Amino acid sequence: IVLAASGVEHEELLSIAEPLLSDLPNVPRPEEPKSVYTGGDYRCHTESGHI
Amino acid sequence: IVLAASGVEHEELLSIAEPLLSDLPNVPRPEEPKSVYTGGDYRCHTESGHI
Secondary structure (H helix, E strand, C coil), rough: CCCCCCCCCCCCCHHHHHHHHHCCCCCCCCCCCCCCCCCCCCCCCCCCCCC | CCCCCCCCCCCCCHCCHHHCCCCCCCCCCCCCCCCCCCCCCCCCCCCCCCC
């Protein structure tokens, strides 16, 4: 989670958002999901009213 | 056009069907439509409610 502000001073954003977010638990992040780039073809002759 | 009967004597089928089919005109037949066997793949992941 990342909180990002534009037009706010950094000491204002810590007087508000720090007492409301500090007690979420520290957990290990998971492993990032994997995939591989194969090739591929795809085609769909369109829905039967289009033409 | 071919008329085909099963259980009828051949001289009965000519007393009925001949005075009604003899005056169609004699025309040349057309050329028979052509195609070639290529290969091919096809796939359709099924309609979205079937699984």
